[PDB]
Amino acid sequence: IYKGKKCRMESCFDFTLCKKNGFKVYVYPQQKGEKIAESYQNILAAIEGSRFYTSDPSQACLFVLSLDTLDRDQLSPQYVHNLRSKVQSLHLWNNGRNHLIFNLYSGTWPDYTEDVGFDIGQAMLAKASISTENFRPNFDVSIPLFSKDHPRTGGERGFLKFNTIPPLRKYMLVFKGKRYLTGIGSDTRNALYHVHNGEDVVLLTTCKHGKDWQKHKDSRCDRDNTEYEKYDYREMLHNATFCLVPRGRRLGSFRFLEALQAACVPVMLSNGWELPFSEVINWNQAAVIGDERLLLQIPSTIRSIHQDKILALRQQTQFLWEAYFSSVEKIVLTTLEIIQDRIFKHISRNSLIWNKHPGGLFVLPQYSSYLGDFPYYYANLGLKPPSKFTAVIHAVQPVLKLLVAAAKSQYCAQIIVLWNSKVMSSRFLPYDNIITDAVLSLDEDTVLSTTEVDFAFTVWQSFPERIVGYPARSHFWDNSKERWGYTSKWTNDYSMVLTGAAIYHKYYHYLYSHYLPASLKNMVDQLANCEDILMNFLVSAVTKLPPIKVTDHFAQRQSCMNTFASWFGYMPLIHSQMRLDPV
Amino acid sequence: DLSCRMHTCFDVYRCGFNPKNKIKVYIYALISREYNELLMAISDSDYYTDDINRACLFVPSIDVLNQNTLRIKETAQAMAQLSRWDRGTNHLLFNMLPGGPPDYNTALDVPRDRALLAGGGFSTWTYRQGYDVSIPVYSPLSAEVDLPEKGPGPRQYFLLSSQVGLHPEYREDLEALQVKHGESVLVLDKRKRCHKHQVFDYPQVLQEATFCVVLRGARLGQAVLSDVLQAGCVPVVIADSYILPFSEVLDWKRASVVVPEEKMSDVYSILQSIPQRQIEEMQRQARWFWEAYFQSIKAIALATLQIINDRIYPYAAISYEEWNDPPAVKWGSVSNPLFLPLIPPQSQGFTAIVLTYDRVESLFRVITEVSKVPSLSKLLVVWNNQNKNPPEDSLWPKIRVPLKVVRTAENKLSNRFFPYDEIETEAVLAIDDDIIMLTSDELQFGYEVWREFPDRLVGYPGRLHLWDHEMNKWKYESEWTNEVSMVLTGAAFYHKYFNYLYTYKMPGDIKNWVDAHMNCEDIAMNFLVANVTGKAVIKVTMVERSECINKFASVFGTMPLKVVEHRADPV
């Protein structure tokens, strides 16, 4: 009854497996006999490189097939044949009780329907182009339709380098695609010449899509083809304010991600398209949703949008691109986090976490479902940062004088001393003895007066998201060796602050403990250093902002930074040249 | 048709676009008092309209809220006889008890092949995600008794379940939990609630517990939820597959706890994990939800129409904060518009705006000194002096950056804050005529600091405010600088969006008063920046002004300024 197409979590899912242990996902072993596409390989590597990967099927409560399923078009070069009996032969399939299926294309030329090919049964499908008429509200996940050139890790860092008021540029609505003479899904693009005006709204289409370039051309191909020139598409998305993303052969398109990257507010025309991550993302803040039936009056509606709303839409679009759509790893982690939050109804991210900086991928509800326990949403609420902090000292005498000085601080609620398993990076573990949100990590070799502690705390009061610390080190790029460097003497700028004398949030401790993979922690422990470097990397990545400075061992730093950058995919560190001092 | 959504089963041609982005609803002229007052609430709302050929939504005058006496065949005949059914493409129906004595279908049993349904008891299978709206089930107790507005705090009971005629399994599990813990869980039995040798009044007993339990006994939706929200206790819904009312726009994760019916014996342990701060937050959210959406039928109708209008007009939809923020935190909210954390590069610079009046020897020194700094994209001179004429073109200083002189129709001090379309940068330096004691490297470092904080003021002068107990009013202080809360606009880097805000989005008549009094413009700019961005200022190195500060604080209703003790200097 409810176990067919109308599958939900209360019927087509086994919560018993997920209740036994943590939320883990299991990848089927590769058969070493079938072709695997680059996109599916990237997805599988993102799953395996994530913290939810486990090798034991019994422990995991979620499964993902290693057989390629992104390309389900019978004429596609990446299609895998005879999947109907191939999927059924798996011993662990179990009719897809807890199976997640990734997909990007479905259907054939006559009709691009939900032709998944093999009978999924009760499995959940993370198909990209899902119509709202066949989308399960709390079972399926909609993902963006990425291309084969989408970066595995890292990103393009957006395009919007200047926030110029007014946001309006030398264009209003642009489009440069390819119309289709025959088929399904070309009605919206064949009528764009009604909307087209040239001066500000320019819509361009081409009817040369194969054999029909001169065979079945109508009396308007020639006019469109001549005007389809002298206007680069990339060189158009940079001067445009609104990007039109209509429906073609399939509801989704690569144009959506390009519009998100180019900071132009998308204006979707694909009617009944379940937007990517629609169950957690409010697309009314980062996009303008429109209906293709009212195609004629679209430019009037676009002009009716106010200036401040346009600015907010552009900024939210850039945030969404930098948070959830930059890389395929981010997409996979977003889907996995949505599925994980779908399990515990009392431990889940609310609608504000996903749609606000930094986003759901960096905010873990398992730490707390209350927004006041995070340093990110103080301004959104009527709350102020806590007035007390718990100092943390990791000891492996100056320490005797240091503890007295730190205790004299008025805002110091308590002091925790760590003595060493001699894991020097274990000081970032979350401890139940910590009550206040702010945490001061202190080294026994650090000399710090109580007035300086008070100044650091009062500075952190204005910046609860960043790290405020006295020691600062920067990073440089070495052209000769093509690897990132590390300098710690007389640096003009800085991009990192050592945790030994820095103030930050205990949620950063929790995120370091429960977010970064075990491989980086193992490398840090084996090298017996490079833990503050990883903490600064995580904080720069989550905040997108540099820290704040207030007033053989060296060679290992370069290898540490290279490994961290390789895992992250880019360099989250941002140079800073300012130094906050008391007045 | 359960399969279709708004994209196919709804007609948008009737309501294409209007300058006032408001949906148009009509009520057919043909009922319980509930439906009568719902129709009255629809009538006196902004969504009401005439001229049927110009309207979009239709609301029939049919009693459909209660299904006990629904007469499904009669309802189908009425829907056919509406004379504007048109397959029911744009007809909205209100319901709160969509259950049947033989079986609780969790949906309305009328044909409604294409109609729009607003039910109270909605399951995940019978609810159209993008089409239907889940509305609260009305309880007359909300308006019949006016409970006191008791603030959040400790209560004698931790868990409470006051329902009548529950299934024996739920009652047995509740009794097991009560005997397992005791003195905190209080289960009540049969307006009057009875315990073992104890009698409690149903409306007021809920005020004595912080968590109230709601169970699925019939229709998947119980009116006890409204009473739970009214009394301030956090609802604990145990219905396995039930979508909470107004879940599309409201954030129920911050107001209610959903525990599956399978883990009914584990409810207490789940509720224990929630800290007290979140408990108070959820109590406030529940009270706000009751007083805004559950208190009155007019509230239900307005919320439903607002949700539908947001669906029809996403570009004009109200914000999440507007939907689900209590008025106190809405007053305390910030909602910074320059929330995107980007660092602009050095390719674009800043446009220096110089305000001069009856002085030309200081103007030339200012221009010469500013021209020494790098990254000076443009330099604009504002000539407020109407009687005097600008100097000849030859006499202007020789610089390599584009210099232009602005012609001012009038002489108002707020001419430095007008957003000029000739400015091509986002940073706008505002150095006045007398500011000549600044070096080039100082301005360059100020612009460097501003690049890291583009959403807040970066200025060299440092001033602050203070509170005087003798006069019970705000004062001004500048002699001693231990903390900084204000930055004078003279030689102060800020976003031109701040210029736009000062010119156009200013509360009441603040600007009309600065111009009249020809003073206190930096004060107004600081107040506006603090109120809009919710962030302090960055500093880089009398009676009239006090009245200015007091008037600005009175207009805002509070003090948007923040006190900080940090300044930026080169490393």
Ligand SMILES: *[C@@H]1O[C@H](CO)[C@@H](O[C@@H]2O[C@H](CO)[C@@H](O[C@@H]3O[C@H](CO)[C@@H](O)[C@H](O)[C@@H]3O)[C@H](O)[C@H]2NC(C)=O)[C@H](O)[C@H]1NC(C)=O
């Ligand atoms: C930024 O400025 C706005 C004003 O445009 C501030 O909103 C105002 O906040 C005050 C209290 O903070 C509100 O006063 C309240 O009025 C209600 C009656 O409506 C009264 O019952 C309360 O006791 C209180 O006096 C005022 O209404 C409100 N203005 C508007 C238009 O809602 C806002 O608080 C400022 N933000 C910051 C961070 O300073």
Ligand SMILES: O=c1ccn([C@@H]2O[C@H](COP(=O)(O)OP(=O)(O)O)[C@@H](O)[C@H]2O)c(=O)[nH]1
């Ligand atoms: O001048 C153009 C036109 C299209 N495209 C690419 O083509 C895709 C969208 O256009 P197309 O008409 O091919 O989409 P379709 O309608 O075929 O799905 C995207 O990947 C664009 O980057 C492009 O790069 N330049």
Ligand SMILES: O=c1ccn([C@@H]2O[C@H](COP(=O)(O)OP(=O)(O)O)[C@@H](O)[C@H]2O)c(=O)[nH]1
């Ligand atoms: O009608 C007027 C009056 C004043 N100002 C400007 O207001 C400032 C007043 O100068 P100053 O800051 O020295 O005054 P103070 O507060 O120091 O007495 C200068 O920039 C003037 O150009 C102006 O533009 N028009």
Ligand SMILES: *[C@@H]1O[C@H](CO)[C@@H](O)[C@H](O)[C@H]1NC(C)=O
């Ligand atoms: C669009 O912006 C780019 C800057 O990236 C600029 O080079 C280009 O000239 C602009 N296009 C037009 C038509 O001016």
Ligand SMILES: [Mn+2]
């Ligand atoms: Mn002066």
